[PDB]
């Protein structure tokens, strides 16, 4: 089984399960520790930002690929916005500050 770009799940824009909904392999937390254990930061960032979750990000990633330029404009993963609106739907004002 292999998926380039298929159908993303409903609530969090992430790929689906294996081979029946044509889905991406799970890059679980142990593999995240394995990438952190190298010096590999860009691979991990694109892996959990633009291969997976940043909704406006991955169309820019795809159009960068098909136009022959392997750059990424990562942004912020959608599952973290979901976590933001879920913690905040308790009485817990959690905000990004600068």
């Amino acid at each position: 089984h292999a998926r380039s770009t298929g159908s993303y799940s409903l609530v969090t824009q992430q790929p689906l399960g294996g081979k029946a909904q044509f889905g991406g392999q799970r890059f679980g937390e142990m593999e995240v520790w394995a990438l952190e254990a190298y010096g590999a930061a860009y691979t991990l960032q694109e892996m959990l930002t633009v291969k997976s979750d940043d909704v406006n990000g991955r169309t820019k990633m795809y159009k960068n690929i098909v136009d022959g330029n392997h750059q990424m404009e990562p942004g912020m993963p959608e599952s973290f916005n979901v976590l933001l609106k879920e913690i905040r739907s308790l009485g817990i004002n959690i905000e990004l500050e600068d």
Binding site: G39, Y42, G68, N69, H70, Q71
Partner: protein, 79 residues
């Protein structure tokens, strides 16, 4: 035409300044503002960048000098 990046690491230390310098150089060559110094052997821009590191004619100092010189040349185009 590349298996081990070891001699590049002999030039540029730390094993990570290598990746950032080679990324900056391959961005110069991919987004086609540049051209390779050493000849390509139908290698991808990544490996031409690493072979350029291995000759030692690209590093962070060479890149910063050439970018500052490029900005000086672009400022010389005002007329």
């Amino acid at each position: 035409a590349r298996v081990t990046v070891q001699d590049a690491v002999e030039k540029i230390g730390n094993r990570f300044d290598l990746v950032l310098v080679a990324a900056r150089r391959a961005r110069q060559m991919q987004v086609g503002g540049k051209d390779p110094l050493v000849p390509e052997e139908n290698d991808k821009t990544t490996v031409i960048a690493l072979r350029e590191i291995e000759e030692g004619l690209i590093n962070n100092q060479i890149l910063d000098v050439r970018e500052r010189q490029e900005q000086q040349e672009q400022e010389a185009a005002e007329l």
